[PDB]
């Protein structure tokens, strides 16, 4: 089963909204980082470190947790580098689950 991700709600969001993030077809036993992202340049994605969560897939490859989304946030690169302000009203933000290798379900688009 190919890994899939679900975010509810995902559209018509307000800043500080708490969304339910669910994953399926994940690698059982593997921990996934649950964060809000935005592709800010070719090959460059910045995420929101101020609101993070992580969940571990069960024996069936499923997991779920909560994530507080932000209309705008101070974006950072996964290596700890500060990127800059990301405005999700203009940029195409997403919520994603990624393992230690950077793999996982396709990011889920969200809108404010």
UniProtKB/Swiss-Prot annotation:
Listed GO MF terms: DNA binding
Record keywords, A-Z: Antibiotic, Antimicrobial, Disulfide bond, DNA-binding, Signal
Kindly state a single biological-process term from the GO annotations of this entry: defense response to bacterium
In terms of superkingdom, the source organism counts as Bacteria
Q: Which cysteines are joined by disulfide bonds?
A: 37-47, 88-93
Query: Member of which family?
Result: Belongs to the neocarzinostatin family.
* Biological function: NCS has antibiotic activity (for Gram-positive bacteria) and antitumor activity (for certain mouse tumors). NCS binds non-covalently to a chromophore which is the cytotoxic and mutagenic component of the antibiotic. The chromophore binds to DNA as a weak intercalator and causes single- and double-strand breaks.
* Name under which the protein is recorded: Neocarzinostatin
- Organism name: Streptomyces carzinostaticus
Q: Which gene encodes it?
A: ncsA
Q: Where the shown chain sits in the full protein?
A: 35 to 146 of 147
């Amino acid at each position: 089963a190919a890994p899939t991700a679900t975010v509810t709600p995902s559209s018509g969001l307000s800043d500080g909204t708490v969304v339910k993030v669910a994953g399926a077809g994940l690698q059982a036993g593997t921990a996934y980082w649950v964060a809000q992202w935005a592709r800010v340049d070719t090959g460059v994605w910045a995420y929101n470190p101020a609101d993070n969560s992580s969940v571990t897939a069960d024996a069936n490859g499923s997991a779920s947790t909560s994530l507080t989304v932000r209309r705008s946030f101070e974006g950072f690169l996964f290596d700890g580098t500060r990127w800059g302000t990301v405005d999700c009203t203009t940029a195409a933000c997403q919520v994603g689950l990624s393992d230690a290798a950077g793999n996982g379900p396709e990011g889920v688009a969200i809108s404010f």
